[PDB]
Amino acid sequence: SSELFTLTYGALVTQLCKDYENDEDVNKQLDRMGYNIGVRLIEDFLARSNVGRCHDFRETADVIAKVAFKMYLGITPSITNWSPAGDEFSLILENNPLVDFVELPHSALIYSNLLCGVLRGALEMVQMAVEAKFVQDTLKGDGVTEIRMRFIRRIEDN
Amino acid sequence: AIFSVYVVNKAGGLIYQLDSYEAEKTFSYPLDLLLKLHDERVLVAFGQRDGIRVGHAVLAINGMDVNGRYTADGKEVLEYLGNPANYPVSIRFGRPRLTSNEKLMLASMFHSLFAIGSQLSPEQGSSGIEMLETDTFKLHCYQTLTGIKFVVLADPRQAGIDSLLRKIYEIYSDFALKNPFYSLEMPIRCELFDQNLKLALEVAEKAGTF
Amino acid sequence: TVHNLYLFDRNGVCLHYSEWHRKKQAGIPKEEEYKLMYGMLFSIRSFVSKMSPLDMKDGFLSFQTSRYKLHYYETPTGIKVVMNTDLGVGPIRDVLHHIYSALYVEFVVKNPLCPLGQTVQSELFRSRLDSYVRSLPFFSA
Amino acid sequence: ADTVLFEFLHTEMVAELWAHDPDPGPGGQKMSLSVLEGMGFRVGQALGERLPFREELDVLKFLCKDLWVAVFQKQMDSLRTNHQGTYVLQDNSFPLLLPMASGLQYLEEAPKFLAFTCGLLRGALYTLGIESVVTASVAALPVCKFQVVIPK
Ligand SMILES: *C(=O)CCCCCCCCCCCCCCC
C-alpha cells in the first residue's frame, strides 16, 4: 500500500494550483513531469519484468494493464473500446490511483494528468509515439476512470 | 538443416550463392495493420495477428500475386489499400525473398564486418568472424590463405559444419587448380562445383542436429 | 578471461567503456573505436535481420573469431551491453542483463544527476561495475 | 504504489521546485528549498495521523521506527540528543542519496534532495503536538543526518 506516493502527489498538485492562476497550466506541467518520470521509469520496468519490444498495440496494451500497472500501482486496469483500426484502446480503472482524499470540488484541472506523461514518456522510449488522455474521471462524477490510448506512429531506429 | 551458402571474393564480391529452402487473411476497412513502402516492397510496419509479423511483405491481394510495390493490375498497392470501396480485401503476407542485389550487398557487408571483428579484437593473431550466432540461425565462415570466404548459414543446432566448410574448400580447390587464370571477380559457373557442393550439402544434412 | 566492456545508447552514443585484459589495441583513438564498434554492431543488426530465413525474436546473440568471443545484449529501449571474452565463456546472458539492471539502471537511471544519452560520469556506477565484473568466475586469464 | 514511483516523483519535484519561493521576505530573499520542505511538512502531517506515547522521547522513537520504516522501508540507523530538545537522527544509507554516490561526487546538489524529508519529520512532529525545526546535513553521500530542534 502506498499512501506516501498518493499523499506526496497530492502535495504537488496543491502546490502547483497555488503557483499557477490557470488550471490548464497545471495540467501541462503535470504531464511534463510525468514524461520526465516515464523516460526513466521505462528502464526500471524492463529490467524487472524482462518483456521484449512490442510490435502490436494489443500486446502493448496487455503489458501496460496486466504487468506495468500491477507492478507500480498494485492494480490491473481493464482494456476496452478497441477502434476498428486497432490503433486505439482504453484503460478502465475502478477508481483513481493517484488520488487519496480530496476536498469537493467546474475545474479544467486533470488531477491525475501526471499519469498521461508517464505513459507517453515510457512508450516513446520503446519506439512508440502515443497520446494518453483522460476521457473519464471518477473525481468528476463519472462511473469509472478511463484513459484513452492512441497510437500515432512507430519511431524509427537512428 | 542448412539454409544457404555464400562464396565471397577477397574484395567482397559474391562469386557463388545457394539457398536450401505464408499467411492469408480477409480485411475490412480500415486495416488492422500499418503498412509502409520499403525498397520497392510493401511491409508490415506495426501490428501482428494470425500469422502476420512486422517485417512481412504483401505477396498477393485477393489471390493476385503482387508486383513489387504495384498490383498485378498495375495500380499502387498502398493506393489500392487506401480506398475503402476496395474492401473487403484478401491479403497474403510472408518473409520477403532476398534479391540478387541484396545478396551482393549482404556479402559485401559481411566482408567489412569480418575485417572489423579482426581489427577490434582484444587478442593478437586473431582471425575475422568464424561464427556468428542468432536465435534462428548460425553463420559459419572459413577464410582461405588467398582470402576467399566460404560462408554457410544453418540451424543453430546443426553440426558437422566444419567438415562441410572443409569439403567446400576441396571442391573449390578443384575449380581453382582446373582454372588457374580464371577471373577472381567473376562468378563460379562450373557445373561440377555446383553439383559437388550440392552433394556435400546432402551429406551435411545428415550429420544430425546436436 | 574478460577483455573489455562497452555500453551503447539507442543512438550509438558510447555510454561507457571499460578495459581489463586487452593485448591488442586498435591502431586508432578510442573516440573512433567507439564509432567503428557501433557501426559494426549496427550493421550486424541489419545483416542478421535480412539473412535469417525465419522471423526472429532475440536477433544477434554473439560472434567468435580465432582468439575471442563477443557477447551482445540489447534492451527494448536501445541499450546495448557488449562484452568480449575468451572462447571458453558460454552464453552469460544473465550477466549482460545484470550489468543493465543492477548497475546501469540502478546507478545511472536512478541517478537524476546523471544525464541520459552521454558518457556516464558517476564514480559509483564505475566502481560497482568494475567490482562486479572482477567477480565473474571467468574474469581471470 | 511501488517504491520507485515515489523516488522518481520526488526527483521531478525537487528538479522543478527547489528554487521556487513565492513568499520571499525582506529584500526579496528566498528561503532555501522552502517549498519542498513545505510539501514534506503537509505529507508528514498526514503520516503522523495515519501511522500506529508518554514523553517526547517516545515521539522521536516513533519517527525512527515507524515513520522511517513506512517511508524508506528501514529504521533510523542512530538516534542522539542533548537533553535540551535538540535531536540528531542519522541514516548511513539514505535511500534518496544511494544511487548518487559513495563519496563527494554530488555534494553540491545533495541538499536539494533532503528538504522534502525534513518537512516529513517536521510535519509528523506537528500532528503530535510538537513545534520544531528540522535541518538536514550531508558531509559525504549517502550518510546524512537530520537535526530536530524543539524550542522550549
Ligand atoms: C512493448 O513495446 C513493451 C511495452 C512496455 C510499456 C511500459 C509502460 C510503463 C509505464 C508505466 C505505467 C504504470 C503507471 C505508473 C503510475 C504512475
Task: Give yes or no for residue A26 CB within 6 A of ligand 1.
Answer: no
User: What's the CA dihedral at C118, C119, C121, C122 to 10 degrees?
Assistant: 90
For the CA of C76, the nearest atom of ligand 1:
2
Resolution to one decimal, Å: 2.4
A80 beta partners: A90
- Tell whether the torsion through CA atoms of A106, A109, A115 and A116 is positive or negative: positive
Single-letter amino acid, residue C41: L
> Minimal CA–CA distance to A56: which of C15, B54, B189, C32?
B54
Q: Are strands C2-8 and C14-19 parallel, antiparallel or unpaired?
A: antiparallel
B10, three cell numbers: 577477397
Count Cβ neighbours within 10 Å for each residue of D22-54 and write b for 16 or more, e otherwise: eeeeeeeeeeebbbbbbbbbbbbbbbbeebeee
Task: Give yes or no for residue A122 CB within 6 A of ligand 1.
Answer: yes
Single-letter amino acid, residue B115: A
Q: Answer for the pair D67, D47: CB distance below 8 angstroms, yes or no.
A: yes
Q: How far is CA B161 from CA B10, B117, B194, B202, C67, in A?
A: 22, 21, 18, 12, 19
Q: What is the DSSP string of A43-112?
A: HHHHHHH------SHHHHHHIIIIIIHHHHHS--PEEE---TTSSEEEEEESS-TT------------TT
Closest residue of chain D to C105, computed from CA coordinates: D99
* CATH at C66: 3.30.450.70
Fold (CATH) for B1-21+98-210: Beta-Lactamase (3.30.450)
Contact B32 A86 (CB under 8 A): yes
Touching pair D, C by Cβ (3+ pairs < 8 Å)? yes
CA of C10 to the centre of ligand 1 (A): 19
Ordered by where they begin, the domains of chain D are 1-152 (3.30.1380.20)
Measure the CA–CA gap between A133 and A90, rounded to whole angstroms: 9
Residue tagged 483522460 (cell numbers): A134
Residue tagged 529490467 (cell numbers): A47
What range does the domain containing A97 cover? 1-158
Task: Give yes or no for residue A112 CB within 6 A of ligand 1.
Answer: no
Single-letter amino acid, residue D61: K
Measure the CA–CA gap between C48 and C56, rounded to whole angstroms: 9
Contact C101 A42 (CB under 8 A): no
State the total domains in chain A: 1
B64 beta partners: B61
Residue tagged 535481420 (cell numbers): C49
* Structure determination technique employed: X-ray
Contact C10 A157 (CB under 8 A): yes
Measure the CA–CA gap between D132 and B106, rounded to whole angstroms: 72
- Tell whether the torsion through CA atoms of B118, B121, B125 and B131 is positive or negative: negative
Helix, strand counts (H, E) of chain B: 4, 11
Residues 30..89 of B with a Cβ closer than 8 Å to A: which? 30-34, 45-49, 53-54
Q: Which long-range contacts (CB under 8 A, 24 or more apart) does A13-20 make?
A: A13/A111, A14/D39, A14/D42, A15/D17, A15/D35, A15/D38, A15/D39, A17/A109, A18/D22, A19/D20, A19/D22
**Cβ neighbours of A87 in B, within 8 Å:** 34
Of A48, A126, A157, the CB nearest to C76: A126
Contact A125 C77 (CB under 8 A): yes
Residue tagged 538536514 (cell numbers): D136
The separation between CA D46 and the C-alpha centre of its own chain, rounded to angstroms, equals 14
Task: Give yes or no for residue D4 CB within 6 A of ligand 1.
Answer: no
Which residue from A53, A115, A119 has its CB within 8 A of the most atoms of ligand 1, so it is best to mutate? A119
Chain A nearest C-alpha distance from B54 (Å) = 7
* Element housing B119 (H / E): helix B100-119
DSSP state of B54: T
Single-letter amino acid, residue D146: F
Query: Collapsing DSSP states into helix, strand and coil, what is residue B76?
Result: strand
Residue ranges covered by each domain of chain B: 1-21+98-210, 22-97
Q: What is the DSSP string of C80-107?
A: EEEEEE-TT----HHHHHHIIIIIIIII
Measure the CA–CA gap between C62 and C60, rounded to whole angstroms: 6
Q: What angle do CA A63, A64, A69 make, to 5 degrees?
A: 115
What range does the domain containing C84 cover? 1-141
Of A18, A37, A44, the CB nearest to D12: A37
Chain B nearest C-alpha distance from A58 (Å) = 8
State the total domains in chain C: 1
For the CA of D5, the nearest atom of ligand 1:
17
- Tell whether the torsion through CA atoms of B179, B181, B182 and B184 is positive or negative: positive
CA of A126 to the centre of ligand 1 (A): 10
How many beta-carbon pairs under 8 angstroms link C with D? 25
Q: Answer for the pair B138, B155: CB distance below 8 angstroms, yes or no.
A: yes
Length of chain C: 141
Touching pair D, B by Cβ (3+ pairs < 8 Å)? no
